[PDB]
DNA sequence: CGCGGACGAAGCCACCATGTGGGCTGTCGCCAGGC
């Protein structure tokens, strides 16, 4: 069966502090635990780091950041934990395992139920798939014209490395077009329309270090008091298309990934 | 009646400042004498 890890697989560039020749690609889990020992991990699409640097911030951050400024001046104590890690200068790999370990086995993408930021499901009430055509950015799309980055004709096209599939993944996450894409009926309900992406047509900062794992600290907002939250990746069950999608006053809901 | 073409359905986000230049041409006086 076919399966790909975001933990072990590598896809993720990564430099080193030293040398700066040959960028080795690591998977998730490997850049995780090697931080402090590489300067920066890159990937090429500015959307799929944009998104990617959320994610990130999210797990590494995550057990970083607590999840939990309760009284203390919390603002303060953040800060205070902040600079204690921020003053170790990296984080032990048992923690890391531990929050793998919690969801070790939900996060390879191909997965027949719980795919990574996927909906398995989808394919069942979709006649028509989109086509990776139509996934992948710099590549045209059913009404696009061939002009530009290789000639596809959507008639036999070249499937992407999985590590490139990755990245598209979660740039069309990030930004993504909006109207008509391919409907998918649920229980009687059909709607080409989609509405764009959060972060669409803007400009993400993120601040950078010496060191990877300097950054990862940095990376984090503050989160203020309020729900637990978790991410896509960190929810229980599936949302299902109809009703509200639910406000989330942690972080998660802060790194715009609740949904 | 069937096929092809055209149109439609959204999601849509705003008291005061200016300086540079240089590259192309031709002419007699004629005859005679001496070296």
Redesign the pocket.
Known sequence: PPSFDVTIAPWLIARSRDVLAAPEMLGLRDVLIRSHELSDVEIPLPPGAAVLWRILALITARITGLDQPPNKNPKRKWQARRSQILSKGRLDPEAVDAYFADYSERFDLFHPERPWLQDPRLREECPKTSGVNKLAWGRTAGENQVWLGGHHHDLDPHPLDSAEAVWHLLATLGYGP???CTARVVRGRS???????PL??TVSYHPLGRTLFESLILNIPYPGTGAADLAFWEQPELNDPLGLPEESAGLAGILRLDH
């Open positions: 909006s109207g008509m709607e080409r329309n989609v509405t764009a992406g669409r047509g």
